[PDB]
């Protein structure tokens, strides 16, 4: 035997150490102490790590419900060496940390010895690459924080501070920051005060100042009330003999100053003199950290000191534009952004000597490759355009819209689109708008990627030029149409998308001839085999339908929608989404255009525009059902949606109960309501829960018009709440909730008091969906019939002998109490005095 003895999943040949004890069968006796337990919790891990998703969720529920029984001992000494394999995967690591956090709510206060053993596995999740692995790392160290308390964390993570390895020291710093978040700063602030002033080895001080830095970059403005007592910790640095300690003290000052913006500048006053001495006296990377620190401090400053500190830091910034090293390039690229966002630096000084060496030394090719040097450079160039002007920057980078690197043209187009989104296009003269029009046409024409940045740049530019783009629409549209004929398939998709960006600028430029030119052109490009071409065709055609009238467009809707009804059978999500957006706009605004049997033969098509995995498709098709109903009447579309209720699939039945509520309220609801009340007599489960779910949605939609239809459906919910199958009771409880909030303040407090008598015995159910449906119904009846009536129901179960009834009645009383605490004062019962205590509220009792 080489694979274990059952329907346990496949053992990869390096998983034959951790599940080695599964190839031999135990026949559980003669080897069964708790070992027969741990082999069992061996088995579950194999069903989790290697299994099919039914095996996954079965073993995962079976390991959460018995985590009290298994104990943290065997469970963690099996789980932890499995994560320490050198041959994991991303998803196996993810399912393992899911297994660890799913037992951290059960093994509260039992992972006390296993904190360090968890941390030596979990700490490298914080420095990991993908974001969600970082989030799982932070989440379960916060859970380990709140579960292990505080003092156990300090006893575990203190030997990991003077440790020799830099990776364990950095990850210990980030673990300290996340336990500081989950347990508050002042809980452990004496420990940080201890470790940062400790003087035996500088690596302890470096670690504690790293802790302060990651606390500041983790929790942003929640460091603000404890800021002064925390910068007093750091200020004993910046004068240490080690350069690493001073460098990380400056970086911690920068993180605290970025965190407390704009505040706390009085708490930063004891830091400015060593910062000034440090930037003046020496050069290196300490200069870079000090420079980042002052660049974050000076926006927190008043305008006199801000002006004085800006005008004598520009000298170093011009001195460091020649700098070779990349991190100081990023740092002065950040410092320029904040050093010119204030008053004081006059625009002519910036345009004479700040920006020319800036454009000489920073608009290179290699700065576009690194993403953190891409985005920082474009966001700094935007701020320099905010201060100086639009034309001075745009004329300096507009010639590089015609470059031969795609990333550099992407950078330049992103800069230009952010400038003309912020500032505007009034500054640009006529000698430069032709420069950038030819620039964006060449940059749009010659992209190899599927990025939308050239598209949004084109849209923002021709939105900013407004009416000044008129002698370029012959140049653009002739570029577009010849773009729509290619052997390539994506570049046709680049063309049609462009039309949907530049449809809005031709009506505001008195150009409806050319819209009448390219609507009829786009009419025949929608027989395209490629789905993502035809999706962008439909998007462009939607933009044209919006920007012209519906009833004055040249491929007119008499013969545009009949061409659209076979497009609607295309299973692609893009084509479906754009086609029913367009069919919905045609259906409400232009329903006088087709046969009113064509609307019937497409409202049989929108039953399979459900089962569509996108949820915007599914919520546009139900609005289309409402519009079709408002056209042709709520008696043919309703029979269609009621035949659809027997289909066995949710995402196909709940989104037709939505549609029944939509046709109910877009017409008047009586037009649907007998037929919808008649379908409760169909003896199938799904159709009865369908009419109850659709009554829930109907009452939620109509709101205050439920005063007329509550007596009609009260004998329906009184029948649904007596039914054995608990989905009847959860959906009828949802109907009771929405109806109770819909008839509030109208005097229908008798029907709701009738229905409460049937809702209230479902209090003791333990299925979570039905208990939240009944409890939402109770807190939605509280406002309808009063807190007095709900207190009369919640009374005498508050002190019942069984805990199982006492805790449910106490949580319904908590919902009433926090719902309406003042109104309960009149409604409390009279409770007589015992021997030692007095309980009669005597003040209410006496009478004038």
């Amino acid at each position: 035997n080489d694979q274990p003895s059952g329907n346990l999943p496949f053992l990869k040949p390096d998983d034959i150490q951790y599940f080695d004890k599964l190839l031999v069968d135990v026949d559980e006796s003669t080897l069964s102490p708790e070992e027969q337990k741990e082999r069992k919790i061996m088995k579950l891990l194999l069903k989790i790590k290697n299994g099919t998703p039914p095996m996954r969720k079965a073993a995962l529920r079976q390991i959460t419900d018995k985590a009290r029984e298994f104990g943290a001992g065997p469970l963690f000494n099996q789980i932890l060496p499995l994560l320490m394999s050198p041959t994991l995967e991303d998803q196996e690591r993810h399912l393992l940390v899911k297994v660890i956090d799913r037992i951290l709510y059960k093994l509260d206060d039992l992972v006390r010895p296993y904190v360090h053993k968890i941390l030596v596995v979990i700490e490298p999740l914080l420095i990991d690459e993908d974001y969600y692995a970082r989030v799982e790392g932070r989440e379960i160290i916060s859970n380990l924080a709140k579960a292990a308390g505080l003092a156990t964390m300090i006893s575990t993570m203190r030997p990991d501070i003077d440790n020799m390895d830099e990776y364990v020291r950095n990850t210990t710093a980030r673990a300290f920051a996340v336990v500081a978040s989950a347990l508050g700063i002042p809980s452990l602030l004496p420990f940080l005060k201890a470790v940062c002033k400790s003087k035996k080895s500088w690596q302890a001080r470096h670690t504690g100042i790293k802790i302060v830095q990651q606390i500041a970059i983790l929790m942003g403005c929640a460091i603000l009330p404890h800021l002064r007592s925390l910068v007093e910790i750091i200020e004993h640095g910046l004068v240490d003999e080690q350069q690493k300690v001073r460098t990380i003290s400056a970086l911690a000052i920068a993180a605290l100053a970025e965190a407390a913006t704009p505040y706390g500048i009085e708490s930063f006053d004891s830091v400015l003199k060593p910062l000034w001495k440090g930037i003046r006296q020496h050069r290196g990377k300490g200069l870079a950290a000090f420079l980042k620190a002052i660049g974050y401090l000076i926006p927190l400053m008043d305008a006199e000191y801000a002006n004085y500190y800006t005008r004598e830091v520009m000298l170093i910034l011009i001195r460091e534009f020649q700098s070779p090293d990349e991190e100081m390039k990023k740092i002065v690229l950040k410092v320029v952004k904040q050093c010119c966002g204030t008053d004081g630096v006059e625009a002519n000084y910036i345009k004479t000597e700040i920006l020319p060496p800036f454009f000489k030394h920073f608009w290179q090719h290699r700065m576009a490759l690194d993403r953190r040097n891409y985005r920082q450079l474009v966001d700094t160039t935007v701020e320099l355009a905010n201060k100086v002007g639009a034309a001075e920057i745009i004329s300096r980078i507009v010639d590089d819209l015609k470059d031969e690197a795609e990333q550099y043209r992407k950078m330049v187009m992103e800069t230009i689109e952010k400038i003309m989104g912020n500032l505007g296009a009034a500054d640009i003269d006529h000698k430069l708008e032709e420069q950038l029009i030819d620039g964006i046409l060449y940059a749009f024409q010659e992209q190899t990627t599927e990025d939308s940045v050239m598209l949004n740049g084109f849209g923002t530019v021709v939105n900013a030029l407004g009416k000044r783009v008129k002698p370029y629409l012959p140049q653009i549209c002739g570029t577009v149409l010849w773009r729509l004929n290619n052997k390539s398939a994506k570049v046709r998709q680049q063309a049609a998308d462009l039309i949907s960006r530049t449809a809005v600028v031709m009506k505001t430029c008195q150009e409806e001839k050319l819209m009448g030119h390219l609507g009829v052109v786009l009419y025949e490009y929608l027989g395209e085999e490629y789905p993502e071409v035809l999706g962008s065709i439909l998007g462009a055609l939607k933009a044209i339908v919006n920007v012209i009238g519906m009833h004055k467009m040249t491929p007119p809707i008499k013969d545009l929608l009949p061409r659209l009804t076979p497009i609607l059978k295309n299973r692609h999500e893009k084509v479906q989404e754009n086609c029913i957006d367009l069919v919905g706009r045609i259906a409400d605004r232009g329903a006088e255009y087709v046969s009113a049997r064509e609307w019937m033969r497409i409202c049989f098509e929108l039953l399979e525009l459900l089962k569509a995995h996108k949820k915007a498709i599914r919520r546009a098709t139900v609005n289309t059902f409402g519009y079709i109903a408002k056209a042709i009447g709520p008696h043919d579309v309703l029979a269609t949606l009621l035949n659809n209720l027997k289909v066995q699939e949710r995402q196909n039945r709940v989104c037709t109960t939505v549609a029944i509520a939509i046709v109910a309220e877009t017409c008047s609801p009586f037009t649907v309501l007998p037929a919808l009340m008649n379908e409760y007599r169909v003896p199938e489960l799904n159709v009865q829960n369908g009419v109850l779910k659709s009554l829930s949605f109907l009452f939620e939609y109509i709101g205050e018009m439920g005063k007329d239809y509550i007596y009609a459906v009260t004998p329906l919910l009184e029948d649904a709440l007596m039914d054995r199958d608990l989905v009847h009771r959860q959906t009828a409880s949802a109907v009771v909730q929405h109806m109770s909030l819909g008839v509030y303040g109208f005097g229908c407090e008798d029907s709701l008091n009738h229905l409460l008598n049937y809702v209230w015995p479902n209090v003791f159910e333990t299925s979570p969906h039905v208990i939240q449906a009944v409890m939402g119904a109770l807190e939605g009846l509280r406002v309808a019939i009063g807190p007095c009536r709900m207190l009369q129901y919640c009374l005498q179960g508050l002190f019942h002998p069984a805990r199982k009834v006492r805790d449910v009645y106490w949580k319904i009383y908590n919902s009433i109490y926090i719902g309406s605490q003042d109104a309960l004062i009149a409604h409390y019962p009279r409770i007589y005095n015992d021997d030692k205590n007095t309980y009669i509220r005597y003040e209410l009792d006496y009478i004038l």
Partner: protein
């Protein structure tokens, strides 16, 4: 006459029958709510309007059967057997200490005058026809939307402070139709499909008919 309406200091009105052949005092109806009634007033042979310590005003009308002939062990819910029912609840904001059915102007009609504890004096007047009641309901249902109160307190959730409101239209919100800017009055009035002088005429007709 032949009936007693005993106001408890905590619970509610308790109907009591007195008999002529015997001399018994038989409880034959009570109310489901607790109230802390201060004073009360009889309106019909059945209904009792009452006011309470906290600020509300209720009207408790007996059910249409409620036979008085009970001669004398279980109750219904630890109380009497024919539970009376409530046909308005309304919050006033002050402890209403005097209720009286009268006619304040000759040539007018009857109206329940209440005098509160903070000096105020108000009236509760019935509606004649359903067109008046529906019109004033739509007027105040527009004024909760267009003209919210100053403190931010929701007006429906002020009048439904202790018990939820029932069958009473707040005319102090309605008579703030004469106190908005005329664009708001034109918006509400065209939403009512009338003209704002006709709405103010209809809005003061009830006051001049019933009271001052």
């Amino acid at each position: 006459g032949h009936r007693v309406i005993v106001s408890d200091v905590q619970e509610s009105f308790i109907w009591v029958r007195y008999k002529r052949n015997e001399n018994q005092l038989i409880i034959f109806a009570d109310d489901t709510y607790p109230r802390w009634v201060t004073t009360a007033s009889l309106l019909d042979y059945d209904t009792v309007a009452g006011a309470d310590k906290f600020g509300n005003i209720c009207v408790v009308r007996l059910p249409p059967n409620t036979n008085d002939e009970v001669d004398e062990d279980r109750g219904l819910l630890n109380g009497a057997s024919q539970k009376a029912e409530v046909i308005m609840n309304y919050h006033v904001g002050e402890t209403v200490l005097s209720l009286q059915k009268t006619t304040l102007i000759p040539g007018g009609s009857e109206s329940l005058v209440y005098t509160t504890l903070s000096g105020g004096i108000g009236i509760l007047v019935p509606f004649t026809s359903h067109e008046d009641h529906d019109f004033f309901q739509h007027v105040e249902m527009h004024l909760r939307s267009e003209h919210p109160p100053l403190c931010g307190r929701d007006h429906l959730s002020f009048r439904s402070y202790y018990f939820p409101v029932k069958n009473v239209i707040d005319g102090d919100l309605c008579e703030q139709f004469n106190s908005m800017e005329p664009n708001k009055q034109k918006n509400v009035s065209e939403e009512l499909d009338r003209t704002p002088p006709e709405v103010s005429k209809k809005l003061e007709d009830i006051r001049t008919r019933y009271a001052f």
